[PDB]
């Protein structure tokens, strides 16, 4: 598309190596800008990375580590912003891309468009076949105002380097090609100006540019240093509302814009909440609370008294340090319809934690979540009590928003479990991110969930492996109850359909309601089947009801 979100796995090892690259391809496939962290680790020696090839910006840092591919095709990456930084120092880290037990290893960074690095430094280390890194004039890459220009490059090798291309002026190259010559854009400019495309003052870049320029104007930039608001680079985006100089009453500003990453945006993108000031967020500002229009979206707005308290999940005010959901906190979810944060259930949880005398969580305390219907951050389940065949305690969960993703990528994660089906019946949407369901031996009924319906953005997919094989499910009989419209269920039975192509008596499908026959006697409304009065018509006559009380049941 245009923008994608990065990941935040750091150096931690891919739970599903067999889906790991397949993950990456999904996230970055069409992607030109990654709001987040470009993290490429653990990639196996013969591994197509052609999808990486459209990326120009990386809003935070870039981490290439523990790989064996020999190329990582980011020729087009042009500026990193180092919003966030690896080990809090580095906007670009390549570590340990070697061999551990026609050699393996990255041979040339080839970062041949990389002229801008706004914040953070460069750490390159332990890369056996890596050539030309010490050819590079790093201070030309680092921005002027870049506070963190410290740099930590290793040169130990186990192979040797051809010369740079004859076209290399000064022989500094990202690789053996002419294409890889380090373009200089900061140290060679006329006057003190921070970027330029040539030695003449006439070549100096507009002060709002970042990586270079095709010209003198703030329309001629390679990347904006602040905000791209159309063809033009500016320091900030037009405000949302202009005031009346006497009254000081807000007036809707016709040419006003929101800010999303480093762009001046007309309207906030799908899963982000818009805001009073003019910013797009994943978390509201200090003194606000979430709104919703009939228009399906959400906004932040300020509140009437110091705000009505709400449930905070893990990764949040108060639980932001806690790894897992556990007996010591299970109570804190007493009857919440919506959790700001995430829930994760680890081995840690259901096993004890004698390290600080905290008790093993019981399969029945989990029922606190039966009222639960919205999760803003992700759901992550990795242990789960053998007793329970499913995730029914979340059978009223209706949206996982993804605003905070596990390891930067996964809104839904079920792994190493013992469950036999899923039972998230009312789960109609995963707001952002991808599902990873892997290594659950007994898991049937995955195939039935119409996962395409839950997803919102096309960088989204289910990644599954090492589950019970569908063949072994269709075979051993387990399948969608015939009353489940279009064949989609979350498990065995008529309780578990995603849609009912007949009626709904409670949480169950029924081919007909009791308006003709049938004992505890009944009536029909919005495809449902509601009971009539404890004493209305006991008859065998025609259409014997119409309603709940003795108000409307014709006697």
């Amino acid at each position, epitope marked *: 598309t245009q923008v994608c979100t990065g990941t935040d796995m750091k150096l931690r090892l891919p739970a599903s190596p067999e889906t790991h690259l397949d993950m990456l391809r999904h996230l970055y496939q069409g992607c030109q800008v990654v709001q987040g962290n470009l993290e490429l680790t653990y990639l196996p020696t013969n591994a197509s990375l052609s999808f990486l090839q459209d990326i120009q910006e990386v809003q935070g840092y870039v981490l290439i580590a523990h790989n064996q591919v020999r190329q990582v095709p980011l020729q087009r990456l042009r500026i990193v912003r180092g919003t966030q930084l690896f080990e809090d120092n580095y906007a670009l880290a390549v570590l340990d891309n070697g061999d551990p037990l*026609s050699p393996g290893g990255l041979r040339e960074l080839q970062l041949r468009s990389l002229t801008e690095i706004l914040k953070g430094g460069v750490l390159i280390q332990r890369n056996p076949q890596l050539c030309y890194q010490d050819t590079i004039l790093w201070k030309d890459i680092f921005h002027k105002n870049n506070q963190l220009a410290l740099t930590l490059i290793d040169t130990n090798r186990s*192979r040797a380097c*051809h010369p740079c291309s004859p076209m290399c002026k000064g022989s500094r190259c990202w690789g053996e090609s002419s294409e890889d010559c380090q373009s200089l854009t900061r140290t060679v400019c006329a006057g003190g100006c921070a970027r330029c495309k040539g030695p003449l003052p006439t070549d100096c870049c507009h002060e709002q540019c970042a990586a270079g320029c095709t010209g003198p104007k703030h329309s001629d930039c390679l990347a904006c240093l602040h905000f791209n608001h159309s063809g033009i680079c500016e320091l900030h985006c037009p405000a949302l509302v202009t005031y009346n100089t006497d009254t000081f009453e807000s007036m809707p500003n016709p040419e006003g814009r929101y800010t999303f990453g480093a762009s001046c945006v007309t309207a906030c993108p799908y899963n982000y909440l818009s805001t009073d000031v003019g910013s797009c967020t994943l978390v509201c500002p200090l003194h606000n609370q979430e709104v919703t229009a009939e228009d399906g979206t959400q906004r932040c707005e300020k509140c009437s008294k110091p705000c009505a308290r709400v449930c905070y999940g893990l990764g949040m005010e108060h639980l932001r340090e806690v790894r897992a959901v556990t007996s010591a906190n299970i109570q804190e979810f007493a009857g919440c319809k919506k959790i700001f944060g995430s829930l994760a259930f680890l081995p840690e949880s259901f096993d004890g934690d004698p390290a600080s005398n905290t008790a093993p969580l019981q399969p029945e305390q989990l029922q606190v979540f039966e009222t639960l219907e919205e999760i803003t951050g992700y759901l992550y389940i990795s242990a789960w009590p053998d007793s329970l065949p499913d995730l029914s305690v979340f059978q009223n969960l209706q949206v996982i928003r993804g605003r905070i993703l596990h390891n930067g990528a996964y809104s839904l994660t079920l792994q190493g479990l013992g469950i036999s089906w899923l039972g998230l019946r009312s789960l109609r949407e995963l707001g952002s991110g991808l599902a990873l369901i892997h290594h659950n031996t007994h898991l049937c009924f995955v195939h039935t969930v119409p996962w395409d319906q839950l997803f919102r953005n096309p960088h989204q997919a289910l990644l599954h492996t090492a589950n019970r094989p569908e063949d072994e499910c269709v075979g051993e009989g387990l399948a969608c109850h015939q009353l489940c419209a279009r064949g989609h269920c979350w498990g065995p039975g008529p309780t578990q359909c995603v849609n009912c192509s007949q009626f709904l008596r409670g949480q169950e499908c029924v081919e007909e309601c009791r308006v003709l026959q049938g004992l505890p006697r009944e009536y029909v409304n919005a495809r449902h089947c509601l009971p009539c009065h404890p004493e209305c018509q006991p008859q065998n006559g025609s259409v014997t009801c119409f309603g709940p009380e003795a108000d409307q049941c014709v006697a």
Partner: antibody
Amino acid sequence: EVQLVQSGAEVKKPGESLKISCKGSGYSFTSYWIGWVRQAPGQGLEWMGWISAYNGNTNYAQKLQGRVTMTTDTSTSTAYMELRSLRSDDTAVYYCAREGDGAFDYWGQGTLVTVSS
Amino acid sequence: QSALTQPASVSGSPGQSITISCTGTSSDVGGYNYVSWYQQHPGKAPKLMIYDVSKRPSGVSNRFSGSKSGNTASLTISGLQAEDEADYYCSSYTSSSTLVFGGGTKLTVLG
């Protein structure tokens, strides 16, 4: 250790084609470039060209053009200088060497190729 | 195409010591710093000393020291340890992605 071992010496008649071999060992063969230089009897060194043993890219001499071809074969760790349409005077010593920073640090033993009528 | 120039000439006196010269154009040594030197004894491969303009492989004697303003190109031997006589070769990298050798010079000590 590091070994570059070349063919036994050659004798070829005018109009024929030469084909020396160079087998490297004890170092990772794909990792380095290999170059060819020759020395006509009691005379100057003359660079012929070099090969990428990793990707197969080749630069040649501009005097030999039309007439040279270097190749490698990763499976067997060997490089193959080939000089066609030999006419005298190519008579020389014909080393192959392992290329560092534009510069060769490990040579072959040599290969006398003699071209007289 | 299109050889660098040296003199076959250096001479010099045991103990110390003189310098060879290269030299060649902007397109070769006068533009690249991939400039290397070789010591060839009669009827042997060349020995590699030194590379990048000024640097010595392991085992190479102290006070082998090439450097200088391009377009030259200047190897220097300092104590004339007795047996240093050899033909001596400069080479450079090239705006045509080619290696190019100098004509060689014959070092020859006195006594």
